[PDB]
Amino acid sequence: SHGLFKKLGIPGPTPLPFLGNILSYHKGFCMFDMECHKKYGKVWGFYDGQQPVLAITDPDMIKTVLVKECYSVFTNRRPFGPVGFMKSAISIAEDEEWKRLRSLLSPTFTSGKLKEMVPIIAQYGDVLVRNLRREAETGKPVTLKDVFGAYSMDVITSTSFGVNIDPFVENTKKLLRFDFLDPFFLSITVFPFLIPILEVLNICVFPREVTNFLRKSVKRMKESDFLQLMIDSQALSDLELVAQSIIFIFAGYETTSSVLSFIMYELATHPDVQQKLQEEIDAVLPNKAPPTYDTVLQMEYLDMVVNETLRLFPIAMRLERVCKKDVEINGMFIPKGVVVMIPSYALHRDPKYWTEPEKFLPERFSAKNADNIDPYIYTPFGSGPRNCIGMRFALMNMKLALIRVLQNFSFKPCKETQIPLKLSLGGLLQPEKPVVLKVES
Amino acid sequence: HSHGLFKKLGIPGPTPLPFLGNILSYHKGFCMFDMECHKKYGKVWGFYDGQQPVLAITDPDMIKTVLVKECYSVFTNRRPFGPVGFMKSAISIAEDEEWKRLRSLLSPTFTSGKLKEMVPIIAQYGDVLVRNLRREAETGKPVTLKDVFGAYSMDVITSTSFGVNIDSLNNPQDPFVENTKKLLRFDFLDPFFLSITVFPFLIPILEVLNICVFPREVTNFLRKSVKRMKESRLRVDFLQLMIDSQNHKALSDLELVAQSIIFIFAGYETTSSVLSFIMYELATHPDVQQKLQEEIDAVLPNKAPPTYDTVLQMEYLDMVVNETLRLFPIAMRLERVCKKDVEINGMFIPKGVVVMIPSYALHRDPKYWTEPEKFLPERFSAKNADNIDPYIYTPFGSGPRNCIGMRFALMNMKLALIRVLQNFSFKPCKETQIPLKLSLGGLLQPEKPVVLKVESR
Numbered sequence: 001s002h003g004l005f006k007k008l009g010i011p012g013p014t015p016l017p018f019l020g021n022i023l024s025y026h027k028g029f030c031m032f033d034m035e036c037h038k039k040y041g042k043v044w045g046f047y048d049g050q051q052p053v054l055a056i057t058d059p060d061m062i063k064t065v066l067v068k069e070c071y072s073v074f075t076n077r078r079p080f081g082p083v084g085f086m087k088s089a090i091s092i093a094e095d096e097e098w099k100r101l102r103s104l105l106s107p108t109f110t111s112g113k114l115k116e117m118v119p120i121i122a123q124y125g126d127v128l129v130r131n132l133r134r135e136a137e138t139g140k141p142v143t144l145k146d147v148f149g150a151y152s153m154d155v156i157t158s159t160s161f162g163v164n165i166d167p168f169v170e171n172t173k174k175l176l177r178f179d180f181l182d183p184f185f186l187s188i189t190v191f192p193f194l195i196p197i198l199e200v201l202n203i204c205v206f207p208r209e210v211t212n213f214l215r216k217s218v219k220r221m222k223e224s225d226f227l228q229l230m231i232d233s234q235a236l237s238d239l240e241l242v243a244q245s246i247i248f249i250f251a252g253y254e255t256t257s258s259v260l261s262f263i264m265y266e267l268a269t270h271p272d273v274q275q276k277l278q279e280e281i282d283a284v285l286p287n288k289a290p291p292t293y294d295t296v297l298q299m300e301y302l303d304m305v306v307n308e309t310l311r312l313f314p315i316a317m318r319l320e321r322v323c324k325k326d327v328e329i330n331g332m333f334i335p336k337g338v339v340v341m342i343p344s345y346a347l348h349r350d351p352k353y354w355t356e357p358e359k360f361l362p363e364r365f366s367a368k369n370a371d372n373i374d375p376y377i378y379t380p381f382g383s384g385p386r387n388c389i390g391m392r393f394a395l396m397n398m399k400l401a402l403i404r405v406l407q408n409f410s411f412k413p414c415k416e417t418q419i420p421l422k423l424s425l426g427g428l429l430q431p432e433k434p435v436v437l438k439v440e441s
Numbered sequence: 442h443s444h445g446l447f448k449k450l451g452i453p454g455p456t457p458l459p460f461l462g463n464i465l466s467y468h469k470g471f472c473m474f475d476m477e478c479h480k481k482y483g484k485v486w487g488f489y490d491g492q493q494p495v496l497a498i499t500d501p502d503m504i505k506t507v508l509v510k511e512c513y514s515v516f517t518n519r520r521p522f523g524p525v526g527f528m529k530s531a532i533s534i535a536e537d538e539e540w541k542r543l544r545s546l547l548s549p550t551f552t553s554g555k556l557k558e559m560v561p562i563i564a565q566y567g568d569v570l571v572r573n574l575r576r577e578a579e580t581g582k583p584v585t586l587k588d589v590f591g592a593y594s595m596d597v598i599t600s601t602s603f604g605v606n607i608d609s610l611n612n613p614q615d616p617f618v619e620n621t622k623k624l625l626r627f628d629f630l631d632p633f634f635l636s637i638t639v640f641p642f643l644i645p646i647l648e649v650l651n652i653c654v655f656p657r658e659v660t661n662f663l664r665k666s667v668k669r670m671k672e673s674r675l676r677v678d679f680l681q682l683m684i685d686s687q688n689h690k691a692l693s694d695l696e697l698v699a700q701s702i703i704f705i706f707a708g709y710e711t712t713s714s715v716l717s718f719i720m721y722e723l724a725t726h727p728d729v730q731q732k733l734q735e736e737i738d739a740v741l742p743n744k745a746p747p748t749y750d751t752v753l754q755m756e757y758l759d760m761v762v763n764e765t766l767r768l769f770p771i772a773m774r775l776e777r778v779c780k781k782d783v784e785i786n787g788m789f790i791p792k793g794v795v796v797m798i799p800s801y802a803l804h805r806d807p808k809y810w811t812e813p814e815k816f817l818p819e820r821f822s823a824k825n826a827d828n829i830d831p832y833i834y835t836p837f838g839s840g841p842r843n844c845i846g847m848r849f850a851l852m853n854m855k856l857a858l859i860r861v862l863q864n865f866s867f868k869p870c871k872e873t874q875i876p877l878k879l880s881l882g883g884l885l886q887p888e889k890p891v892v893l894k895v896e897s898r
């Protein structure tokens with residue numbers, strides 16, 4: 001099954017037996033995609049064990065997979081197991097169950113519901129300033145991932161459940177941990193046949209206590225909102241309701257806080273960009289005025305900085321869809337069962353599409369130059385019917401933190417500040433050493 | 442009284458007459474009056490359209506402050522235009538929160554993805570444009586460019602915004618074009634558009650008489666045309682976005698037609714007028730026309746069909762379109778109503794004053810452009826484009842209330858110029874007005890229509 005890309009004429013690295021090309025992941029997913037982007041051109045294929053993966057970079061071919069042929073062919077992502085009761089998660093659901101959950105959780109982040117969350121986040125935006133002021137008046141570098149993690153936890157636990165927590169961050173911080181050095185997930189890539197061995201016999205990849213604590217915490221949350229929508233629509237099951245809460249809690253904590261740490265690093269390493277951003281926030285909101293829903297979307301340089309950070313640090317790295325039947329798109333034959341992959345990290349730094357892609361230049365997303373950006377090359381939230389469902393929720397929650405903090409504090413690098421920031425050469429997109437900076441009031 | 446405002450503020454300007462103000466100086470038109478004031482009074486001057494004081498600014502920082510920085514807070518709305526009737530809900534006429542809702546609603550109409558989807562549709566009518574140009578070319582005979590460009594522009598804006606192929610082969614007496622033409626006629630000689638400026642108190646009187654600046658013949662026709670243009674069920678164009686957003690709430694039936702008439706008028710008149718000015722400059726400069734044709738053939742050899750990416754690759758084509766818009770900014774002026782007392786760049790502006798940006802005069806300012814009356818596309822080359830201020834050259838405006846169909850118009854015009862210059866070259870005639878005299882009336886148009894010979898290659 002390792003002569004597939006040799007048959008279809010698609011170039012790619014030579015695979016090893018059983019392993020395939022997973023030994024090239026020693027530098028990470030990002031470095032392997034960028035080296036293959038230069039060696040084999042626009043389209044190449046490799047093997048994650050015995051699973052063939054076709055990598056595409058053509059925007060028209062990307063649009064056909066993500067948007068056009070979504071509901072028809074490229075509907076589901078790579079099979080991820082064994083998950084146990086987490087098989088009902090919207091991000092892991094497949095075919096008919098996904099559409100029922102996508103439509104059920106779509107009214108969660110409308111313009112009406114997002115406008116209701118502004119006063120709720122406005123409460124947590126004050127404790128963030130008061131806690132940073134304790135570390136500001138005292139010469140002491142702040143681990144931004146910590147203080148932003150608590151801010152990211154209170155927002156998703158209140159805007160989705162109405163419960164104020166002020167053990168969840170400890171249990172949530174230990175939900176993923178996708179380390180390729182761990183032979184377990186390196187085995188699932190090599191042994192896709194061991195997934196049915198653990199599904200019929202009830203074995204999961206997530207630790208029991210991070211799933212038992214959340215299944216019992218959601219039951220305490222069930223005091224008869226995003227939770228209010230899942231009860232009024234309840235045919236939704238009770239155990240299925242827990243699986244969706246784990247997805248929202250983890251995304252609202254890990255994704256928003258890690259990107260916020262990426263933003264503050266770029267602002268501290270580029271003073272003229274942070275200073276120009278502070279002058280704009282003081283103009284739209286003078287005297288440290290509380291931000292509203294309209295003043296957030298009005299700040300465009302705030303949008304030009306966030307969109308530039310998401311280009312440099314796409315926490316997704318890759319988008320994946322599984323070909324469910326024999327098709328031919330843009331004059332290329334993709335057989336059934338092939339995982340079509342779109343290297344987001346490699347495309348966000350393609351010299352063919354970006355000038356000086358290494359350097360932090362928010363001028364790429366200016367309304368004068370944003371017309372030169374392909375929407376299928378810059379996909380930090382994906383695209384099509386199966387993109388990020390909390391895209392507008394994440395872009396709002398991160399900007400609300402950037403407004404309220406830059407109105408009161410200014411960030412400078414420290415001695416222990418890793419410059420340049422080296423990304424984690426492992427699995428998920430994170431810095432090697434934690435992001436630490438000095439806070440000046 | 443009010444005619445002493447600029448005397449009180451120390452701002453120079455022509456001495457106004459009672460009641461009339463300075464409107465008698467419009468005998469040469471908006472453009473000539475603005476350039477003469479810019480030479481005598483300097484960077485800032487003020488005049489009166491009757492009793493309405495108009496402050497003209499030419500400073501790029503002051504222009505950026507009005508158009509970009511202080512749009513949502515102070516300079517949000519244009520000068521009130523009436524009587525308009527139900528067309529007050531149009532995006533270009535809407536004010537304050539109504540415009541802000543409509544702007545965000547119609548913004549996804551012209552994205553890079555939506556525009557790239559329109560190229561195959563525009564490519565269809567590009568082939569029809571070449572066929573009609575080839576009949577008038579196979580036989581020595583002038584060719585009124587405004588007519589053949591007007592039929593092409595109506596074909597593009599109706600199909601890309603509504604999905605309806607209305608003009609088929611022509612139909613040279615097409616009812617859409619015939620009804621949309623009489624939709625714009627600001628003849629300052631007509632007392633109507635001159636008296637309502639002298640008597641602004643008559644606008645609320647005319648609004649209660651159901652009197653509009655648009656004739657009932659063209660509004661009732663377009664009212665039932667858009668209603669019959671709703672066909673379903675069976676894409677996602679301009680019409681589909683308005684129905685999906687129709688289902689705070691919401692978009693009315695009379696509001697959906699108001700925006701459609703705006704998109705129909707802009708896509709027809711503006712695109713066809715600039716194309717006529719472009720071809721006049723190419724015929725009167727055969728060297729520029731040859732260099733542009735050599736670039737189209739280099740990017741699209743063997744008459745290759747134009748695509749979204751090949752259009753953006755042609756630099757000289759972008760330089761020809763930009764230089765023509767510099768000489769002929771169909772906007773002429775940009776205006777914003779100052780809604781509250783402000784002090785920008787060290788100058789006080791009181792509430793109610795209309796801040797005006799003389800775009801026509803700024804595009805021909807000798808202290809910004811070398812030989813401003815000469816047609817030189819080399820100003821917009823990448824070697825010289827850094828010496829161009831984006832607040833002196835504003836053919837599509839600037840800020841949150843600039844031209845919402847800028848990127849569409851730049852594509853529809855370039856897609857037409859490519860497929861036309863691929864097959865034809867244009868030369869002047871005996872009846873071609875050389876030099877071109879602009880209409881001394883209101884809107885920016887030529888005196889005698891642009892007529893040229895069409896030779897095949």
Ligand code: HEM
Pocket residue numbers: 066090091092102247248251252255256259310315316319320379380381382383384386387388389390391393394395
């Ligand atoms: C900076 C913040 C975030 C980024 C960059 C991000 C990125 C992404 C990407 C790239 C995808 C997949 C798109 C595709 O496959 O085409 C995705 C899916 C998803 N995201 Fe996010 N995300 C963020 C925050 C959030 C938040 C706050 C939530 C809150 C619920 C969330 C919930 C989800 C879910 C449920 C899915 C799967 C939807 C489905 O499979 O149908 N994400 N995200």
Ligand code: HEM
Pocket residue numbers: 508532533534544703704707708711712715766771772775776835836837838839840841842843844845846847849850
């Ligand atoms: C060569 C072609 C065109 C030129 C030179 C042009 C120029 C302009 C200018 C200068 C403005 C005012 C900007 C400001 O006040 O700051 C404007 C506004 C506008 N234009 Fe265009 N335009 C063109 C074609 C089009 C097209 C094809 C459409 C299609 C819908 C369109 C729709 C509009 C609308 C709706 C506005 C008002 C926007 C608002 O009030 O928010 N225009 N145009």
Ligand SMILES: CC(C)(C)OC(=O)N[C@@H](CS[C@H](Cc1ccccc1)C(=O)NCCCc1cccnc1)Cc1cccc2ccccc12
Pocket residue numbers: 077078079080089091092175176246247250251255315316317318319320388
């Ligand atoms: C795992 C691989 C990449 C081989 O196969 C997939 O593709 N399995 C997708 C589903 S595992 C995941 C389950 C999980 C993990 C850890 C804690 C809790 C649940 C999942 O539910 N995650 C989406 C929900 C939250 C989120 C995260 C980031 C951004 N927004 C929202 C993985 C997947 C889902 C969605 C977007 C992705 C982008 C890049 C890479 C993988 C993606």
Ligand SMILES: CC(C)(C)OC(=O)N[C@@H](CS[C@H](Cc1ccccc1)C(=O)NCCCc1cccnc1)Cc1cccc2ccccc12
Pocket residue numbers: 519520521522531533534624625702703706707711771772773774775776844
């Ligand atoms: C009327 C004056 C100039 C004193 O006061 C304004 O300012 N009234 C603005 C709104 S009248 C117009 C209504 C109309 C007229 C004729 C047919 C159909 C509708 C309008 O809706 N037109 C914008 C939409 C179309 C368009 C036109 C040209 C370019 N692109 C798009 C006038 C106005 C609007 C937008 C840009 C302008 C530039 C220069 C001068 C005036 C402008």
